[PDB]
């Protein structure tokens, strides 16, 4: 019964029992015991007066699982399927390519001058390793926007190239640099595709980009007979007339399609100049050039292991292969879009992938009243893998007490544990499969 529920609020790791002793000092016969608890599934039976009278513990040999599954205290005959089984992985493989230079991103970010937005510049970065964790937890940036990928995990990914785009933006038009925006900038100055993938950065620069007299070095194109397509550019400067025919000013309806502009030091928050940088991540399925810092390991063939070849994660059994990749192919796929093979980055070996063993387990019993004997059938597996996984506790579910004796037998449907083979034939009592039959019989 529950005597107390006490709000002490401390953590207890060790304890001492207190005894009494008497007159010189002596002792008297006394004994006590200790045991530990484990998180387990129990079944409870309530009597008509509301009192518990019995329990079973589902993890203490398979027959407990049979009773727990059928919600009974008695089972009569047959073969019953309770749950799946599988093998736990035993190790980890990490296999990034080897790269030794440091990304010079500062050559873009720390540049003294930015271009005019109408003619933005593009620079490529490749064959280097660097960490993104600086700009993530730093306050220098007025806004951080990332699409397709979360910024916390950029350190676990490999990219084939990075492209950095740079330009100056006016005031609050930072809202226009996003997918699906509309307006003079989003349609004439620059344009982002629908399936954009990358991060957008901005920071305020009134210290060097503005002055009281104003700086008038920047321009933007507000007039054009048609909106740009994604990442297009047009650096043409010509007289413009709404008729679509050439003319020369100061004649009628002759204009310049781009407007000169300037900032002021006393601009309000909605007006100061900002610098913007856009990073586009090319996840091309080819050899990666830029990667985050990780230590690699050796390979562990022919064992169930975790694997992280190049930003791809799973569990499986690695084996050599007879694939023949073309020099421009790095991955192979099956139907249902599952990865099937990969090129080892360090040595360009070709390696297959395959799953760790899995299947169903079912329990064969005679009547509970007659006896408590059981036999276990592991379906569609070679016994070598289950015996080598029962030992060293690699299988799950894990009984507290059980043993594979000398009785192991192989069948086409799988292999039986705990049943003795016999070189004689009888009529079937319980059919197993492929011609194998079982019964409960004298030795």
């Amino acid at each position: 019964k529950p005597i107390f529920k006490l709000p002490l609020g401390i953590n207890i790791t060790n304890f001492r029992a207190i005894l009494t002793a008497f007159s010189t000092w002596g002792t008297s016969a006394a004994a006590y015991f200790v045991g530990y608890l484990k998180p387990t599934t129990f079944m409870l039976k309530y009597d008509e007066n509301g009192t518990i009278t019995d329990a079973v513990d589902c993890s203490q040999n398979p027959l407990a699982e049979l009773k727990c599954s059928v919600k009974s205290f008695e089972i009569d005959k047959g073969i019953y399927q309770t749950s799946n089984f599988r093998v736990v992985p035993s190790g980890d493989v990490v296999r990034f390519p080897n790269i030794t230079n440091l990304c010079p991103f500062g050559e873009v970010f720390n540049a003294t001058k930015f271009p005019s937005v109408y003619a933005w510049e593009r620079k490529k970065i490749s064959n280097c390793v660097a960490d993104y964790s600086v700009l993530y937890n730093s306050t220098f940036f007025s806004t951080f926007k990332c699409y397709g990928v979360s910024a916390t995990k950029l350190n676990d990914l490999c990219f084939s190239n990075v492209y950095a785009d740079s330009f100056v933006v006016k005031g609050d038009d930072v809202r226009q640099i996003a997918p699906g925006q509309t307006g003079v900038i989003a349609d004439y100055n620059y344009k982002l595709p629908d399936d954009f993938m990358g991060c957008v950065l901005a920071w305020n620069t009134r210290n060097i980009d503005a002055t009281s007299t104003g700086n008038y070095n920047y321009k933007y194109r507000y007039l054009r007979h048609g909106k740009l397509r994604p990442f297009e550019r047009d650096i043409s400067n010509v007289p413009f007339s709404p008729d679509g025919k050439p003319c020369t000013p100061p004649a009628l309806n002759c204009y310049w399609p781009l407007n000169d502009y300037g900032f002021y030091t006393t601009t309000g928050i909605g007006y100061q100049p900002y610098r913007v940088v856009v990073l586009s991540f090319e996840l091309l399925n080819a050899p990666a050039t830029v990667c985050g810092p990780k230590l690699s390991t050796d390979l562990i063939k022919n064992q169930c292991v975790n694997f992280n070849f190049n930003g791809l994660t799973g569990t499986g059994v690695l084996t050599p292969s007879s694939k023949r990749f073309q020099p421009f192919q790095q991955f192979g796929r099956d139907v249902s879009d599952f990865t099937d093979s990969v090129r080892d980055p360090k040595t360009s070996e070709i390696l297959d992938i395959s799953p760790c063993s899995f299947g169903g387990v079912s329990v064969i019993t005679p009547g509970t009243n007659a006896s408590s004997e059981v036999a276990v059938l592991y379906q569609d597996v070679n016994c070598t893998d289950v015996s080598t996984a029962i030992h060293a506790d690699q299988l799950t579910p894990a009984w507290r007490i059980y043993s594979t004796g000398n009785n192991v037998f192989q069948t086409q449907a799988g292999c039986l544990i705990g049943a003795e083979h016999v070189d004689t034939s009888y009529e079937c009592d319980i059919p197993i499969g492929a011609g194998i039959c079982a019964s409960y019989h004298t030795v």
Partner: antibody
Amino acid sequence: QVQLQESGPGLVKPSETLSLTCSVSGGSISSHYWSWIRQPPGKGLEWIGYIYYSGSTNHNPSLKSRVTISVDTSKNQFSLKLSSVTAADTAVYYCARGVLLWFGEPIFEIWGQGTMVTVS
Amino acid sequence: EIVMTQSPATLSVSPGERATLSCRASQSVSSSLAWYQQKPGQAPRLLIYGASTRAPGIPARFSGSGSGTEFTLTISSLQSEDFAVYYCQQYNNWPLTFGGGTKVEI
């Protein structure tokens, strides 16, 4: 991979000029910073200056007049000359490539074998 | 302008027990210190560039930590090959400065 190798005279008379050259192989001067360092005997390092592509150059906030530095894209070489040289200027001199990560100054990642020069 | 000092001036240790070196600076910096190793008659090498980031190919036993004005380098499981002089340099500000270094004595 790249290799930095440097050459120059071993001895300079007082109130004369010293000059050194350092030169590249395996690659060519393009997008990285290039730096001159010296180590006086038994003492901590000193940074004299660095120059990068397109001629832009940086020097120590002192000794500004004691040196000028030049870079030639042609023949993959760069050089310095010292306005004056004294006994206390003896050191091992190094050329090294500087890489800039994000902000601030560059980290010196690849080092030249260096050479010992003295006055007498 | 940042000025730099490193302590102590000398250490000695025997094989298999860890030791730590510390260098201090006059004003706040963040993740702007690099650790250099030098061996008799050889050019330096880069071990740690980030605040706590191993340069590529540096043995896994090297590590360091710090922020603000205090930083420390931890060397564990020392082997005779680890005999060297060590320096710390900061690139956060425009002027470039290297520490006075510390001699580790066999």
